Design a protein around this nucleic acid. Structure first.
Ligand SMILES: [Mg+2]
Ligand SMILES: [Mg+2]
Ligand SMILES: [Mg+2]
Ligand SMILES: [Mg+2]
Ligand SMILES: [Mg+2]
Ligand SMILES: [Mg+2]
Ligand SMILES: [Mg+2]
Lengths: 387, 322, 220, 101, 176, 43, 158, 117
RNA sequence: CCUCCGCAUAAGCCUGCGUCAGAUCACUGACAAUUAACAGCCCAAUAUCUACAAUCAACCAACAAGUCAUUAUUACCCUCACUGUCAACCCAACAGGCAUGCUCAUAAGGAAAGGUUAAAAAAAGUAAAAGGAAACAUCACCUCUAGCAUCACCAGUAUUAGAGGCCAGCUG
RNA sequence: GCUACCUAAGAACAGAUUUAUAGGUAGAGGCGACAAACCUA
RNA sequence: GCUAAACCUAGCCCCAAACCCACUCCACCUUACUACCAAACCUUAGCCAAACCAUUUACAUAAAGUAUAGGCGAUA
């Protein structure tokens, strides 16, 4: 069953005038006139090409004359790719073992009560109430309006602790920074083209989390392979690509080392947003991508097991559900299914409030409900990492 | 329906007109590692960040200069939080609307079924600063309330529609950047950047090279009156209950490369003809000329990096409520 | 008239397609079918009725996974988003098909019968005779034209050399070739028949206005 | 110029140049109160804002800074003895703000 | 400056200004092309002067000081433009032999009549110009009847005019 | 009597020169207006 | 296109009838053009081809009015220009076959100045004559140079 | 409902009033976001001479004589422009004398025109 | 004293209570105006992507199943033009109608009475003793037809599609 | 451009709703919760 | 004695003779009057007459309203 009916297809030209069949004679057409005439023959025009070049009427060459048409298909992962099997597929493409819960090295930063902004419930209540209610002139702010403002204001609350820690004066957050990283995985080449908001750069790299006992203990782990799903579903099969490793930056850049990828889901529609398992998969591929490009910038394109492993953490959100991720990239020999594996610590479904009421009901007042500040304790644990 | 005062305005000599609409005296003047972080932001946006899509010239100040100014404010509010703890608890709104609606004057309707009737001429400013800093407490005033100053406000000789100023009817908004339930109603500082139309390259190409600095000055008066005035409305004051204390805010506005600095001291919400009879009091806008932050940027670093411009940014960010 | 049919997309797409009501009208704007028009809006999910299609640079039988068993407005049965290899596609659901179920689309005609599960698709030479089938082709490579509505089923009656004979739910028997693919089991959404519309609102919401044995057929 | 076919510009082509200007211009007095630096003209219909800027710059050496035009509808409401509408012709009005103070 | 829209400030209100003749054509055929360029701008600025003076004359409800020199300046712009077009045309006849500066063709629209079609500039050639090919430069056979009807309406108007001229001639011979 | 409920899109799309010339019968409408002598052949 | 009386008496309803011929997609081989054409044809045309002893004779013998097809007249102009030129493009590298085919139809030799105009409709001949006598006009520089060198050669002979 | 009135740009709905304009010429083109790009080359430059020391006023004195109208035919312009060069080079390749066969290499082509006025 | 009106945009109309002048219950001529930021006027190809409604979107709650999205490579550097902008207004009638946003009695808009008398009859309103009436469609059901694909039915497939039938009380 | 049904993409206050805009169906016709109603008095 | 009355001459009609028109510049089939981008032919039917209607029914001179045709009738 073919798609597209004949009435919507390009209508075939009527068959040629029978004069074009007689071999001896030149037809007499309306091409001597400069207009259609129905009692002369329809001429056959040579395929015209505009000699000069104009940009608004450019017609690019077909997909062989492009100077990088590699026949071996690269599967690309851009920020819009909504994966199918959720986290398992990114764990396969990443060659990593998952560990539920953040490590004690990160959560112990907020173990003492000294690492606290004063009245953190009042401040985070004001960030939630500001962005989700008090923000704009509209009566309720839409998600595209408030979600970067929730993330941005929480980063300003954690940025207000330069008074307690001077080291946070060595980190910036850049935006519209696009990294890229290609790696081989069993049979076919993969690329992540990373274009997400708020890569928080530092001067200093993050100190590693997993010891060599745990990295070595990843060898007996096996990746849970899956089926019928070939594990490249919903990536973008591109033939016209370029293998390239980009940290997003020119060389010689202060604040060069990625710290946290603050990637968010600010689409107003439920179908237009990433489902939260796919959100977590997008975080694993972006932190893997930027950490991997950091490894290619520090160590060449050498498939090896890294001695100074790179650790890049990321926070992804829908606006009220937070998903935390610490990624520990310790091998670049991705193509085998054995050896040491990367390892990642996740926090799933860490909502910082159940719901927000932007109008009073008649009973329940204006404001959030279900607020739980342990999630901001996790957020602020991730901001204080390496300080 | 009301006049629609645009702060970042193409109109010639719109500064003198806005001092009429606003009842302001424009007084010229004012009442280390920061250089490293500033040059890090400059070189970050011009040089170090790799662009996927090619930055054309029209696309520039949307792509290039806007996150430059965002990064400057977020890093200076970062680093200057120990020197000024009021910025540690101060809200930082990025591209957030400020509206103010006031009534200034009277007009008898010249044509129509309403002819010969007093219709007071309303105005609204809708503005988006690039980013503003709002404190829960209020900066102390620069000059005393009801400070006399001998220079006189302009008086236009014609209808404000003879400046290209146009009328619409839409929702009258008085808005500081957030609704009135927010605890941070008062305002510290406000950072603007002039749009692609108001480049000084065009203003030199067109023969209005005089009005270049006027553009800065107009964005001074319309924005800050719409901000301080809106702050005065959130504290309950209005045109008949005039402000009992002066409301003060502050603005560095720029072209991306040239910076100018402004202070604004709202003393009167009494702008109507009913309320400008026993009203000697007036609003005062302090201002500087424009000075370039850097001079050029080549391949690797900046050249001709001025330092007093960073010191006036910092001295704006460093004052405090009491 | 300006009738351009919406039935115009060329490539198969997993996404819903905005479709345009005809109103009962022709391409000439006159009512040919009375009593159509004015329903709730619907989007069209493109169904792949060629059930066995090997994908690009693959062949032979292949497994596929059910991701979601989805209501479809355009038809009576509900459908299944079903992904295998590098491609998702919408197929039509059988009665017990869960999310997460695995379904084998097979091509090899065995020597013996294949004790197939509830929702898989086999050539009619590979089935135990006297089983309920659905989504039956008419040529090898035609695509599944019949036994397609909600809860319907037809039983494979008997087969001759290179030929199977089906009982359609109107009990008219059909002679098709052996190597035409049909899916086993009965179509989902049973008790679509046992239902009370209750008010005429649901008659109007489905796009409906008010108004004004045969011989065993062959295809060999 | 007006009532002249313009040559088509293709990207990379020469500058379009007018050597004898077809369209005239007349500066009228403002019928309302206007600012001191605004000079009001009656542009003919086809003259754009940019043509007027270069027209006053080239021919009259006037430092023009802003130009704002309005098209004025002349009335088609006055009739002959024949009950046939006479149209007073429509005209474009240029409002010119002069530079340099 | 803007004072070139106004004449000599001594002439303001004098209600009569001595102006010379207009340029005739043969006086202008002796001038070079650079000189006709410069004279075009002399007459151009003078014409803007006189048009401001007309519009202010209608504004103040007064009559013009001398409306004749507007007729003289339009007279000279017409003669000068005609001279410049003569030299363009004679050079066109020598260099190419054409007679029209703009190309065209005798075509025959939907309405049957033969029209000089003036060509327009386009970028793409005519056979893939989507809007050009919606124009019909052929008349179908249901038009030839209306061509005959139009032909006979013109022949009636001509016959009426010729006959009416002869009747006026007979009245002249009866009167004289 | 408020049968005429005006719009310019329906007026030009109903009776304009382009719809009149789109058909042969409408071209004959134009030709009869041109032959009666009329000042407006269409909208 | 006519009418019948309903049962072959004039005292019944006069009701109208169209008599359509019987059409047949057949296929022919013109030896002069040397090509197989797929032509819709009727039984009477096949019979006239048989009575003319070939489609080349059927086309070169039948009068333009009698033949009454634009396509058959274009076949006639093709064959007649092929015979009017004695074309080597009939059978290249076989000159005996060319001369045998060309001598078989020697009867219908028409000059080339007449064989172009065979079967053109009047508007198509208006076009062909329009393209014959279209010329870029002569730039009057060349005409005036010719007259002036003529005049200086009259002064040279004085 | 008017037919006699001219269809001007002031007259339709918003979509009609925006499209139709007066007789002005396009200077550039619209781009995405409805952003008009102005092309510098399509704007006419008024080539305006220097009037300094120029001795021709707009009127002619009445003391000047009357002459006879002799329009410039191509025979005259050939005679004075070309004829001395051909008489000189004939008493002692027509492109030598100021003739060009084509003018596709030429900036100011005479047929069809590329200059304005 | 009314205000169930207003003010704007839309559509429509096309200078239609601006100034000067004049003729006429007591329009003509001249001149002048509506200034773009609002709104129209857009988009470089070729491929390839777009399963998870909206409802304060959170649970719940569903069915009639829903209004919103890119990436890959190539090309790409100039820039703010054009048009709308007025009014007491439109379609009718010689009563009515009109989309939307705000205001929900008005900050905006207006005037039911030319003067008199206070007859009849008529219209409307208020008061009144005592009395207190003196067929089609369609859920559902049945029947018949129809084994099928690229312009309806239908991008549907017999659980489908189509055609049929069905007292007391008050009151001029 | 009314009116009847339809379509596209909307809106409003709860639908077998009301409605603006643009398109479609044309007289041997259309359209009809069929009044042999309506289809510019 | 008000209202009015009057008025000749615009033009037109019928012949004859003769074969007409149609690019100042610009714009004009897109929503005509807008500077500029990827397909034509296919019997006229009926009114009316026949006192209805149903086949039928007109579209130089002279032969001649003759031969003919025709519900052998109206009529042609
Ligand atoms: Mg305008
Ligand atoms: Mg705009
Ligand atoms: Mg208005
Ligand atoms: Mg009022
Ligand atoms: Mg009265
Ligand atoms: Mg009573
Ligand atoms: Mg009869």
């Amino acid at each position: 069953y073919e798609w597209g009916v004949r009435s919507t297809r390009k209508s075939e030209p009527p068959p040629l005038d029978r004069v074009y069949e007689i071999p001896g004679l030149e037809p007499i057409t309306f091409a001597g006139k400069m207009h259609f005439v129905p009692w002369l023959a329809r001429p056959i025009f040579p395929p015209w090409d505009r000699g000069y070049k104009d940009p608004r009427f450019y017609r690019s060459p077909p997909l062989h004359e492009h100077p990088l048409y590699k026949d071996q298909a690269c599967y690309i992962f851009h920020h819009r790719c909504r994966l199918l099997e959720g986290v398992k597929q990114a764990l396969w493409l990443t060659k990593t073992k998952l560990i539920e819960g953040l490590p004690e090295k990160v959560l112990s930063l907020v173990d003492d009560p000294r690492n606290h902004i004063e009245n953190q419930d009042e401040c985070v209540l004001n960030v939630i109430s500001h962005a989700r209610l008090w923000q704009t002139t509209e009566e309720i702010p839409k998600r595209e309006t408030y979600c970067p403002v929730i993330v941005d204001n929480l980063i300003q609350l954690c940025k207000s602790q330069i008074l307690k820690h001077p080291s946070l004066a060595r980190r910036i957050c850049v935006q519209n920074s696009t990294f890229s990283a290609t790696w081989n995985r069993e049979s076919l080449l993969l690329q992540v083209r990373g274009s997400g908001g708020a890569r928080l750069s530092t001067k200093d790299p993050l100190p590693t989390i997993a010891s060599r006992e745990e990295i070595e203990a990843t060898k007996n782990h096996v990746l849970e392979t899956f089926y019928p799903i070939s594990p490249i579903i919903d990536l973008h099969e591109c033939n016209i690509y370029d293998v390239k490793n980009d940290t997003g930056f020119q060389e010689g850049y202060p604040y060069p080392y990625p710290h946290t990828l603050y990637l968010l889901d600010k689409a107003n529609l439920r179908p237009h947003r990433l489902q939260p398992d796919q959100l977590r998969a997008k975080m694993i591929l972006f932190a893997f991508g930027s950490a991997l490009a950091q490894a290619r910038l520090l160590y060449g394109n050498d498939a090896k097991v890294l001695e100074q492993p790179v650790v890049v953490q990321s926070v992804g959100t829908d606006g009220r559900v937070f998903h935390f991720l610490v990624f520990q990239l310790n091998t670049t020999d991705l193509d085998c299914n054995e050896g040491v594996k990367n390892l990642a610590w996740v926090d799933s479904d860490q909502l910082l409030y159940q719901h927000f009421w932007c109008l009073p009901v008649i009973v329940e007042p204006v404001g959030p409900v279900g607020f739980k500040p342990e999630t901001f304790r996790k957020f602020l644990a991730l901001y204080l990492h390496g300080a | 329906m009301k006049y629609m005062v645009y702060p970042q305005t193409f109109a010639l000599n719109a500064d003198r007109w806005y001092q009429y609409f606003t009842k302001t005296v424009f007084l010229s003047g004012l009442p280390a590692a920061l250089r490293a972080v500033a040059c890090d932001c400059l070189l970050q946006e011009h040089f170090y960040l790799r662009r996927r899509r090619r930055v054309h010239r029209y696309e520039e100040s949307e792509v290039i200069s806007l996150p430059f100014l965002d990064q400057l404010v977020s890093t200076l509010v970062g680093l200057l939080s120990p020197h000024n703890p009021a910025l540690a608890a101060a809200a930082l709104d990025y591209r957030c609307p400020v509206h103010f609606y006031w009534v200034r004057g009277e007009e008898i309707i010249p044509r129509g079924h309403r002819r010969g009737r007093i219709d007071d001429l309303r105005y609204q400013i809708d503005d988006k600063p690039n980013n503003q800093i709002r404190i829960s407490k209020q900066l102390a005033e620069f000059v005393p309330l009801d400070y006399s100053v001998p220079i006189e406000i302009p008086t236009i000789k014609c209808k404000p529609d003879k400046l290209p100023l146009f009328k619409r009817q839409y929702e009258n908004h008085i808005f500081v950047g957030s609704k009135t339930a927010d605890p941070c109603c008062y305002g510290h500082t406000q950072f603007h950047l002039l749009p692609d139309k108001l480049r000084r390259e065009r203003l030199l190409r067109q023969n209005c090279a005089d009005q270049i600095e006027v553009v800065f000055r107009a964005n001074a008066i319309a924005s800050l009156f719409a901000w301080t005035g809106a702050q005065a409305m959130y504290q309950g004051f209005w045109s008949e209950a005039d402000v009992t204390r002066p409301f003060v805010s502050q603005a560095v506005i720029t072209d991306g490369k040239y910076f100018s600095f402004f202070c604004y001291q709202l003393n009167t919400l009494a702008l109507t003809t009913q309320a400008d009879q026993n009203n000697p009091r007036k609003n005062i806008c302090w201002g500087t000329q424009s000075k370039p932050l850097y001079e050029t940027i080549e391949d690797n670093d900046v050249k001709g990096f001025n330092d007093d411009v960073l010191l006036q940014i910092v001295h704006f960010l460093l004052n405090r409520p009491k | 008239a300006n009738f351009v049919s919406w039935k115009s997309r060329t490539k198969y797409t997993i996404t819903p397609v905005k479709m345009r009501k005809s109103g009962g009208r022709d391409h000439t704007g006159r009512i040919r079918v009375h009593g159509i028009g004015g329903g709730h809006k619907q989007r069209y999910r493109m169904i792949d009725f060629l059930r066995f299609r090997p994908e690009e640079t693959k062949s032979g039988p292949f497994e596929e996974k059910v991701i979601q068993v989805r209501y479809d407005p355009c038809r009576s049965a509900d459908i299944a988003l079903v992904a295998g290899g590098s491609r998702k596609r919408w197929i039509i659901a059988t009665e017990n098909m869960q999310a997460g179920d695995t379904i084998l689309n097979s091509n090899h005609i065995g020597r013996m019968a294949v004790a197939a599960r509830e929702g898989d698709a086999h050539p009619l030479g590979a089935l135990p005779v006297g089983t309920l089938i659905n989504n039956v082709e008419s040529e090898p490579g035609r695509g599944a034209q019949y036994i397609r509505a909600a809860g319907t089923c037809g039983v494979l009656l008997r087969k001759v050399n290179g030929t199977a004979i089906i009982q359609l739910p109107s009990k008219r028997q059909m002679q098709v070739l052996e190597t035409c693919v049909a899916t086993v089991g009965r179509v989902s959404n049973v008790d679509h028949n046992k239902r009370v519309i209750g008010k005429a609102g649901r008659n109007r919401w489905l796009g409906k206005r008010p108004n004004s044995l045969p011989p065993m057929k062959s295809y060999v | 110029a007006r009532n002249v076919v313009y040559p088509l510009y293709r990207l990379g082509g020469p500058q379009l140049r007018v050597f004898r200007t077809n369209f005239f211009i007349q500066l009228v007095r403002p019928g309302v109160a206007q600012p001191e630096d605004t000079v009001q003209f009656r542009i003919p219909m086809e003259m754009t804002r940019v043509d007027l800027r270069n027209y006053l710059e080239g021919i009259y050496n006037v430092p023009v800074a802003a130009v704002r035009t309005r098209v004025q509808h002349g009335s088609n409401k006055r009739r002959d003895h024949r009950n046939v509408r006479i149209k007073k012709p429509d005209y474009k009005v240029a409002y010119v703000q002069l530079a340099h103070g | 400056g803007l004072e070139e829209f106004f004449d000599d400030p001594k002439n303001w209100g004098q209600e009569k200004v001595k102006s010379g003749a207009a340029w005739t054509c043969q006086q202008l055929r002796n001038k070079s092309n650079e000189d006709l360029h410069k004279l075009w701008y002399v007459l151009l600025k003078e014409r803007n002067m006189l048009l401001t003076l007309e519009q202010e004359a209608k504004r103040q409800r007064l009559p013009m000081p001398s409306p004749e020199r507007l007729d003289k300046v339009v007279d000279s712009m017409d003669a000068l433009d005609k001279v410049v077009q003569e030299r363009e045309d004679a050079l066109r006849l020598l260099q190419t032999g054409q007679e029209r500066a703009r190309p065209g063709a005798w075509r025959r629209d939907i309405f049957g009549r033969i029209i000089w079609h003036k060509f327009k500039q386009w970028v793409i050639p005519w056979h893939l110009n989507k809007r050009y090919n919606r124009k019909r430069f052929f008349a179908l056979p249901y038009v030839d009847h209306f061509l005959r009807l139009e032909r006979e309406k013109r022949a009636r108007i001509k016959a009426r005019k010729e006959n009416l001229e002869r009747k006026k001639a007979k009245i002249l011979l009866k009167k004289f | 009597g408020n049968e005429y409920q005006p719009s310019n899109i329906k007026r030009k799309n109903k009776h304009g020169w382009v719809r009149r010339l789109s058909t042969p019968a409408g071209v004959q409408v134009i030709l009869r207006r041109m032959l009666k002598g009329r000042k407006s052949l269409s909208h | 296109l006519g009418q019948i009386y309903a049962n072959n008496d004039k005292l019944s309803k006069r009701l109208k009838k169209v008599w359509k011929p019987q059409l047949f997609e057949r296929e022919f081989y013109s030896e002069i053009l040397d090509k197989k054409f797929t032509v819709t044809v009727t039984m009477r045309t096949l019979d006239l081809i048989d009575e003319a002893y070939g489609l080349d004779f059927y086309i070169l013998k039948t009068p333009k009015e009698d033949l009454c097809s634009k396509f058959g007249m274009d076949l006639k102009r093709g064959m007649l220009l092929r015979l009017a030129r004695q074309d080597p493009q009939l059978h290249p590298e076989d000159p005996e076959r060319r001369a045998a085919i060309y001598d078989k139809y020697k009867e219908f030799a028409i000059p080339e100045e007449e064989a172009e105009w065979v079967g053109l409709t009047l508007e198509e001949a208006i076009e062909k004559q329009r393209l014959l006598e279209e010329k870029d006009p002569v730039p009057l520089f060349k005409i005036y140079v010719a007259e002036l060198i003529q005049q200086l050669q009259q002064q040279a002979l004085s | 409902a008017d037919r006699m009135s001219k269809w001007t740009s002031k007259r339709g709905p918003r979509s009609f009033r925006g499209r139709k304009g007066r007789g002005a010429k396009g200077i550039g083109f619209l781009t995405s976001g409805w952003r008009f790009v102005q092309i510098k080359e399509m704007v006419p430059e008024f080539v305006v001479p220097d009037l300094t020391g120029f001795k021709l006023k707009p009127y002619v004195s009445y003391l000047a004589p009357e002459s006879e109208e002799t329009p410039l035919t191509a025979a005259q312009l050939f005679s004075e422009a070309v004829a001395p060069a051909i008489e000189k080079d004939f008493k002692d390749n027509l492109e030598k004398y100021g003739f060009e066969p084509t003018q596709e290499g030429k900036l100011f082509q005479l047929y069809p025109r590329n200059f304005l006025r």
